[PDB]
Symmetry: C3
Subunit: 292 residues, 3 copies
């Protein structure tokens, strides 16, 4: 029971232990959206948190300090000063070097697991990229760390078959929130089936069962983009076919997403914002009921 | 020290802890064999268990309840009522929803590890399928959970080279029971070599060493199909090349196995039953000696 | 808390109290170098250790016994008598059978972690081989076990892109020692970027941060070959293209390095020896400062 006393890794948690909490990544705000819409979303998520009675804990690293529950001003400062995009393996160097960093899903789940946050929300996870050599730390983290992650499936830029198959391989359980269709970020339909659940109570029973059986995996609760905003995948696919990928590593994802906003004259941005907002609502409902 | 109390995940063990025990999956009985042969195999295995002095604990999920040591009547009910095929990640879903489920090797090792069963028997494990995107949870579980698994290698429908290579990558130790040839389910030879051991005592020395050095991996003890039933691999390969794969996910394996039974007029079925029965015998000898 | 008492796994540690320690593999000496050069290097590395104030613990298995801190005379016996090349999964097998074995990086990190050695030194790690189905245990180990590993990157015979991507996927942190370029064993130049650190104090900060945040991964400290011994990678590649790979499994790596010694007229042997010696120095500096 007697654990080590930290010196180098300073965590500043603004989260009340006795109150529902949803963790959220910073890279969506810093690298995944334009500034104006990024701050509008933050504000809207905070509004939803007040409406529903949960704490929204945006997670980032500010000059080497891990902050759970960043403020708007902190997020603006981060965007203005610049911040590396970090997954799990990058957390140590940025902490050691005293840098700003915006977390992906992998780092966000990793850190959430160490500060008592069980429900995390994102837009879409990383996965296996076309070519099947470039593979997100997100998959590794979900195979290693227990949480409930609300998402609209996996990002549209990915090798869908390879990612969906590897989620099975890695023993990452999936459930569709009121759908049997694995969602694909901008798109509702994938033609891949998942088990359907009808309410948040069912999520909690699965998750509690995972705990009892010591299954240390992320539960993916899949929440499709609202129909009104969806862009059918057949349409996204074809745009992706025109884009020469000029970059690698962590720039790949931001690069393609920014290109798709340009190409669809903002349609993908509208979709992305809509699903992020819906996902925050669902994540909040889960966090509120978990806390009972 | 102090562990949680289970509420959702009810395990009914019919094992006497003081007697030797071998765990066995349900999917082979429910999805991998025809009913008549499945029940005759179950009865023959129990007979062997009584003759050699170990308990055969067939593991499955009945209306959400984990049963270790299913009866012939329970297995018949499962067949009649239907059961999901479940690997590890699916256990929580079926427990939560109160469904029947027949376990694969992954789920069976995972549960065995939580209920004190150290020896598991199968016919052939899953692996990397042709195309190398579809990969069994069996590999992940074997790379995560310690047990002694007796099998006749990996199923003949797999990408043999990719699977054999990944077993090494994942640090999954393989030993031939009185052979240096990696077996391939219906076939005695794969063309690949493994280290050989001579007896059950040598298996247990490896296993005990793994415990002492905290190597949490499955030890695969390889037992070839009897020579009078074996089918040369090239024959199976040529048949498989004539099958259009009309299914995906969990259906792939039972689909291909059923097609091969039809194409070989039961030749593969007789091989499969032969190797299952011999594997039960070897697993029971290990379980009996382990018990001291 | 109370741990088990060992019976089967005898570990003989020659490490003394009150002294920094660096762990080192045996397969380099046994399978990776000619006899004369290997014994020469062992003596040199010992000299560096006495002069700099650390213990160099060459790890191997002598007739089933794990020895940390082998003598010259033991190494010589091992070469004369023969030793299996073993990664992690093979340790229990050779321990049980009472065989000599020379450890790879995987086995060396695994063992080091169980005997309190935190700094390990090698020349180059394994990785993803061309074709991408053969993948070293080294990668799995580094994604499972915490240590500081000094190497000159990954061996030149590997699929460099695949390996480099998989290091990210598995969450293996990398830092360049006074370089931003990922080294390639005989070559300094990969065109692949890593974060640059300037001194051993920076290494220790990153490593201590990893402990505090429960990141159980190997930290790769990347030390390029000295410029006077460097061979351009394209030159190495051109030569590898002229080789028919006539072998599989563990034999691949030594088979190809030997061929390169032959085709290059000792040139790779000389580079190999120089980087191993420089890596020993760096690992010793790390070990000494860690202990404080
Ligand atoms: Mn503001
Ligand atoms: Mn439990
Ligand atoms: Mn990537
Ligand atoms: Mn131990
Ligand atoms: Mn063939
Ligand atoms: Mn599959
Ligand atoms: Mn800590
Ligand atoms: Mn290999």
């Amino acid at each position: 029971k007697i654990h080590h006393h930290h010196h180098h890794v300073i965590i500043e948690s603004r989260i009340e232990k006795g109150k529902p909490v949803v963790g959220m990544e910073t890279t969506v705000f810093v690298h995944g959206l334009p500034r104006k819409e990024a701050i509008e979303l933050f504000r809207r998520a905070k509004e939803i948190s007040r409406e529903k009675g949960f704490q929204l804990a945006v997670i980032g690293i500010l000059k080497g300090k891990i902050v759970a529950g960043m403020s708007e001003e902190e997020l603006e400062a981060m965007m203005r000063e610049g911040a590396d995009k970090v997954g799990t393996r990058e957390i140590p160097i940025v902490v050691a070097e005293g840098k700003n960093a915006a977390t992906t899903v992998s780092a966000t789940i990793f850190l959430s697991r160490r500060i008592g946050i069980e429900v995390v929300v994102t837009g879409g996870t990383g996965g296996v990229h076309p070519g099947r050599v470039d593979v997100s730390q997100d998959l590794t983290e979900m195979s290693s760390s227990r949480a409930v992650l609300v998402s609209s499936g996996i990002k549209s830029i990915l090798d869908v078959e390879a990612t969906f198959e590897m989620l099975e391989t890695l023993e990452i359980p999936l459930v569709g929130f009121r759908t049997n269709e694995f969602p694909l970020f901008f798109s509702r339909k994938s033609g891949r089936r998942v088990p359907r659940i009808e309410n948040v109570e069912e999520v909690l029973k699965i998750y509690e069962s995972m705990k009892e059986m010591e299954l240390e995996k992320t539960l993916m609760v899949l929440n499709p983009v609202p129909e009104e905003y969806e862009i059918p995948h057949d349409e996204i696919e074809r745009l992706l076919e025109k884009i020469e990928l000029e970059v690698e590593g962590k720039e790949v994802t931001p690069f393609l997403l920014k290109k798709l906003v340009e190409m669809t004259n903002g349609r993908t941005l509208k979709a992305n914002l809509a699903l992020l907002e819906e996902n925050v609502k669902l994540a909040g409902e889960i966090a509120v009921k978990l806390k009972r």
